[PDB]
Ligand binder design. Structure first.
Ligand SMILES: *[C@@H]1O[C@H](CO[C@@H]2O[C@@H](C)[C@@H](O)[C@@H](O)[C@@H]2O)[C@@H](O[C@@H]2O[C@H](CO)[C@@H](O)[C@H](O)[C@H]2NC(C)=O)[C@H](O)[C@H]1NC(C)=O
Ligand SMILES: *[C@@H]1O[C@H](CO[C@@H]2O[C@@H](C)[C@@H](O)[C@@H](O)[C@@H]2O)[C@@H](O[C@@H]2O[C@H](CO)[C@@H](O)[C@H](O)[C@H]2NC(C)=O)[C@H](O)[C@H]1NC(C)=O
Lengths: 535, 530
C-alpha cells in the first residue's frame, strides 16, 4: 500500500488514487460519501450526515451524477455533450472529491471549493471540464468539489411542509462545506483559508452561502463566475414554487391537485426518478429561455429575504470577492427557444423575430416592461438590421440574467465594505465548437480556470496554455491572499468600486483596465425597471 | 409724390415708405389694419374684418405691440431685450406689414408670410430681427408679417362659452392670411404661392394651420423652425384651459361664464398680464399660461392625433432646429443656472431641474428621464449634467416634437426637408455654454447680417445669403436646393437625413436625436397611459 493514498476522516478510512499530470503527481480522493443516500423516504429531505464506516472506502473514481434532465437538442455535438452526465444517473449521488499535492503538504494549504452550475437542474462534479488535477499541480492548493441534488430532487418546494421544504440542494452544498471544515486538514488543507468558487447556478450558489449566516462561517472568500444569487432565474417565491411543485405532482398523478402536503409528497416519492425529470420543464408558466423549473426558494430559512435585499442590507467588511462575466453571456441561450435562432446558421433574425424574442428572454413581465426593453435595445438609426438585432437580443438575455445581477452585487458589496475584483473574459477558445456568431459564450472560461489546456491529450495552442497558467495564478493568488495580483513589472488589477467601476479584460493580451460592466444597460435593469414593475 | 408707395386694397388707400438696403431700395407698407380693434366688448372675441375707410391710411411705421408680459430677468441685456416690445403696448394691435421689391413687381411674386414666436404670450411683427427688407431685396419675394393677440387676450378660453371661446389669436393669424389672399396682388404678390414660416410658437402656429381645414386653403407651403403644433407646450386641454381662465379671474378680483368674462373685460389689460404666470400649475420652464386649446373647433383633435391620421400628399414642408434648443430656457427656473456663470450644476440640482423641465409627470416618468439622460459612468459630472438637462428640455419641447412631425408627415405623403442650424453668431451676447440657443437662426434667415450698421463677419454675410436662398428656393419650388454642383436630401422616417447649416458646406447626417426621441415619442406616451 501507498501511505500517500490513505487518509482517515471523521467517518472512517479512505483510499485514493495517484494521478498523472503534465507537471507531476497529484493525489485524488474521488467519490467520498458525505451524506446518507437520499433514497426512497429521504427523497426531497435535507441531507443526513454520512454514518461512520469500518474498513477502507475506495475513493478512486467519480460517483454517480445526480438525477437530471439530459440535453438532446444537438445529439453528438461536443458543445452540448460536454455538459451532459459522464456517469450513470442515480439519486445515490451525494459524494465529493478532494485533490491534493503528492506528497501531501506538510503545512496547512489553502483550499478551493468548486460548486458547479447547470441551471440548478443539471451538472456534476465529474465533468471533464472541472478536473481538479491541473489547478492542484500548478498552484499547490487543495481543491474540493461536491455533488448536490438538482431539479425536483434538489429544489422542489412545498413551503411550510417538513416533507419537501425546498433548498435541500443548497443544504447538500452546506453539508459538504461542513465536511471541509471537519476533514480537509487530514489532506493537508487549511480550514481557515477556504475560497468558494462556481459558475452560473454555481456562482449564484456561492452568493447564497454569502447571504446565509450558517454557511458564512464555513468559508473566507468567494468567486462568482457568470452568476449571482440575485439573478431573476436563481430564486423563486414561495407561491410560485408551490404552484410548480403542485403542477409537477399533478402531471404525474399525485394525488390520485394539492391537498395534504404529506400525502402529495408521499405520492411523489413513489414515482420513478426519470418520470419526474420527464415532466420537469412542463411546470414553467411560459415559453422562455434562461428559466428553470426548480431553483432555490425564498422562504425565510436559508434566505431570510430576497438576495437583492440581503445584498443591499449587509455589512461585508472583511470579505474579498472576485466576480466576472464572459464577453457574450447571452448567445448560448438564444438557440434554446428564441425564434429564428440556430447554432447551424447565422441566426440573422428579423425585427418581428426580435420583438418576439424579447418576450421569450424577458418572460412574465408587463407589456410596458417589454416596451422599455425594446426602447433601450433598439438602435433607432438601424431598427431592422438583422445583425444588430441578433447581438441585441443576445445582450438582452445576457444583461438581464447575468451581467447586471453580477454588476449590482459587485457594486453593492464594494460600497458596503468588501474588496471586489471584477473581470470580463474575452478569449474564444480555439477548440470551441459553437458557431462564430456566439462569441465567447456562457461557461467557456471554466476550462481555462481549471487549466484543461495543459492536458496533452487536447489540442490547445501554446498561447492558450500560457493563458490558462496566468488565470490559474490569479485565482490561486486570490484564494491565498484575497488579491489576484502577484506579490512587480506586471500590470495591476485594481479593485472594483461603485464609482470608478474598474474591471480587467482577460485574454491573450496583458490586463487592460476598463470602466463599467455595461453600465448604461445595467442602470436600466437594476435601477429603473424595478420601479416600473412596482407601479 | 411717389406712386410706387400708394396702393389701394379692399378697405381703402395706403401710403407706404421706401427703405434702403445695401442692395437697393425696398417698398414697405407697415401698420396696415386688417381687423377691427379688439377692444372693450370685443376683448377675447374672434377678430372682425376691418371696415373700409376713406382717405389714405399712413402705412409708414410699425403699429402698436399686442399687450404682453415684458422680460425683466436681465434689464438692458441685448439677449433678452431683442425679444421685448419695441413699440408701445396696446390692445389695438391687429396690423400687418408688407415688404415688396422697388419698384413694386408688376408680375406675380411669391409670398412669404412670417408668424412670430414668443410662447403665445409675447412677440411682435416689428422686432428688428424680423425686418423683411433684406429677404425681399435679395430674393425678390413679397413678405408679409402680422401681429396677433397673445397671452390671455389671444388664448384665454372658457370652452363652450361665446364670450371667451379661445384661439382668437389663431383666428387673428387666419384673418391676416385671408387678407393676403384678397389684397396681396395689389402689391405684386401672387396669392397662389403663399409660404408660411415661423419660429417657436410661430412654427407651432404654422403647423396648426396645416391641421385646420379652414386655414389649409389659404397657403401652399410651410416652414416650421424650432417648433411644432404637437409640442407639449403648444396646446392645452379644455379642462385645464378652464381652470387657468378661472384662476386668472380669481387673482384679479372677478367672480356663470358670462359674468366671469364681463368682469375680466373691465380690468385694465396690464392687470391681466401681471397675473398671467400665476395660473400655471407648477414651477416650470417652457410652459405658458394661455396657448391654443383643443376643443373640436379650430383643432378637431389633438395635433398629435391629426398628424398621425392625415393624408399629406402634395405638401412640401421645411422643418429644423438649432443646435442647443434647451439652453436659453434653463435660466428661467432650473436650479443652479445663470447666464453669468458656467452653470456647472450638481446632481441634486440636475434631479430637481428634471421636474422643472418635465412638469406634471409621474415620479416614474421622471425616473425614466433620469435613466435616459444620465451617463452612468459619470453620474455627477457638472459639465455633463448641464448639457444633459439642456438636452432634456430641448428634446422634450422642440427636437422630438419636430422629429415626430417630420417623420409622420414624410411617411404620409409630404416631402420634408430637415436642418440643424449649428452656427453660433459672432454677435451673440449669451454665454458660450449656451451654444446656439433657441431663436438665434432667425437673424440669419432674415439677412440681418447684411445690415452694415451691425458687426457680423464677411463669412456670416455670405452665410445669411445662403440661407435666404434656401428659404426662398423652398417658397418658389418646394425644394431648397440650387442647381446641382452638395445636395440637400428629403427627410424620411427611415433614412432620417437632414443637413447641418453653418459656415461649412452642407453636410448630410442621419437622425434628429433618434435615440432620445424614441423615448419621448414612442415609449413615454405608453408609460403615461398606465
Ligand atoms: C436558422 O434556423 C432556424 C431554426 O431552424 C433549424 O435550423 C435550420 C438551419 C434548418 O435546418 C431548420 O430546418 C431547423 O429547424 C430557422 O427558423 C425555423 O424555420 C422553420 C421553417 O422555415 C420553422 O418551422 C421553425 O420553427 C423555425 N425555427 C425557429 C423560428 O426557431 C431560421 O429560419 C434559419 N435561418 C435561415 C435559414 O436563414
Ligand atoms: C451660478 O448662479 C446661480 C444663480 O445665482 C444668481 O446669479 C449668480 C451670478 C450670483 O449673483 C448669485 O448670487 C445669484 O443668485 C447660483 O445658484 C444660486 O445660489 C444661491 C446661493 O448663493 C441661491 O440662493 C439661489 O437660489 C441659486 N439660484 C438658482 C437659480 O438656483 C449658482 O450657485 C451659481 N453657480 C456657481 C457659482 O458655480
Amino acid at each position: 500500500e501507498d501511505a500517500e493514498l490513505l487518509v482517515t476522516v471523521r467517518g472512517g478510512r479512505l483510499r485514493g488514487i495517484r494521478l498523472k499530470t503534465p507537471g507531476g503527481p497529484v493525489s485524488a480522493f474521488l467519490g467520498i460519501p458525505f451524506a446518507e443516500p437520499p433514497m426512497g423516504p429521504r427523497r426531497f429531505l435535507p441531507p443526513e450526515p454520512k454514518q461512520p464506516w469500518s474498513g477502507v472506502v475506495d475513493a478512486t473514481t467519480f460517483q454517480s451524477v445526480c438525477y437530471q434532465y439530459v440535453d438532446t437538442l444537438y445529439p453528438g455535438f461536443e458543445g452540448t455533450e460536454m455538459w451532459n452526465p459522464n456517469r450513470e444517473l442515480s439519486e445515490d449521488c451525494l459524494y465529493l472529491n478532494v485533490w491534493t499535492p503528492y506528497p501531501r503538504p506538510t503545512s496547512p494549504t489553502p483550499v478551493l471549493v468548486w460548486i458547479y452550475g447547470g441551471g440548478f437542474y443539471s451538472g456534476a462534479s465529474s465533468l471533464d471540464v472541472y478536473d481538479g488535477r491541473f489547478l492542484v499541480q500548478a498552484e499547490r492548493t487543495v481543491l474540493v468539489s461536491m455533488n448536490y441534488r438538482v431539479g425536483a430532487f434538489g429544489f422542489l418546494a412545498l413551503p411550510g411542509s417538513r416533507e419537501a421544504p425546498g433548498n435541500v440542494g443548497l443544504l447538500d452544498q452546506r453539508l459538504a462545506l461542513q465536511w471541509v471544515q471537519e476533514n480537509v486538514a487530514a489532506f493537508g488543507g487549511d480550514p481557515t483559508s477556504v475560497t468558494l468558487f462556481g459558475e452560473s447556478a454555481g456562482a449564484a450558489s456561492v452568493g447564497m452561502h454569502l447571504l446565509s449566516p450558517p454557511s458564512r462561517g464555513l468559508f473566507h472568500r468567494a468567486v462568482l463566475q457568470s452568476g449571482a444569487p440575485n439573478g431573476p432565474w436563481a430564486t423563486v417565491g414561495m407561491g410560485e414554487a408551490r404552484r410548480r411543485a403542485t403542477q409537477l405532482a399533478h402531471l404525474v398523478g399525485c394525488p390520485p391537485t394539492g391537498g395534504n402536503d404529506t400525502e402529495l409528497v408521499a405520492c411523489l416519492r413513489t414515482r420513478p426518478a426519470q418520470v419526474l425529470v420527464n415532466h420537469e420543464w412542463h411546470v414553467l408558466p411560459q415559453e422562455s429561455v434562461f428559466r428553470f423549473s426548480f431553483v432555490p426558494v425564498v422562504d425565510g430559512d436559508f434566505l431570510s429575504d430576497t438576495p437583492e435585499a440581503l445584498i443591499n442590507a449587509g455589512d461585508f467588511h472583511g470579505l474579498q470577492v472576485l466576480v466576472g462575466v464572459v464577453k457574450d453571456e447571452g448567445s448560448y441561450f438564444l438557440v434554446y427557444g428564441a425564434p429564428g435562432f440556430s447554432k447551424d446558421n447565422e441566426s440573422l433574425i428579423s425585427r418581428a423575430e426580435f420583438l418576439a424574442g424579447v418576450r421569450v428572454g424577458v418572460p412574465q413581465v408587463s407589456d410596458l416592461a417589454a416596451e422599455a426593453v425594446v426602447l433601450h435595445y433598439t438602435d433607432w438609426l438601424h431598427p431592422e438590421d438583422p445583425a444588430r438585432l441578433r447581438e441585441a437580443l443576445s445582450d438582452v438575455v445576457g444583461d438581464h440574467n447575468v451581467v447586471c445581477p453580477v454588476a449590482q452585487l459587485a457594486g453593492r458589496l464594494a460600497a458596503q465594505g468588501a474588496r471586489v475584483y471584477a473581470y470580463v473574459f474575452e478569449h474564444r477558445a480555439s477548440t470551441l465548437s459553437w458557431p462564430l456568431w456566439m462569441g465567447v459564450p456562457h461557461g467557456y472560461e471554466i476550462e481555462f480556470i481549471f487549466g484543461i489546456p495543459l492536458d496533452p491529450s487536447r489540442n490547445y495552442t501554446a498561447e492558450e496554455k500560457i493563458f490558462a497558467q496566468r488565470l490559474m495564478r490569479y485565482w490561486a493568488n486570490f484564494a491565498r491572499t484575497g488579491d489576484p495580483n502577484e506579490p512587480p513589472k506586471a500590470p495591476q488589477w485594481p479593485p472594483y468600486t461603485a464609482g470608478a467601476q474598474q474591471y480587467v479584460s482577460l485574454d491573450l493580451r496583458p490586463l487592460e483596465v476598463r470602466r463599467g460592466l455595461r453600465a448604461q444597460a445595467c442602470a436600466f435593469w437594476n435601477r429603473f425597471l424595478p420601479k416600473l414593475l412596482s407601479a
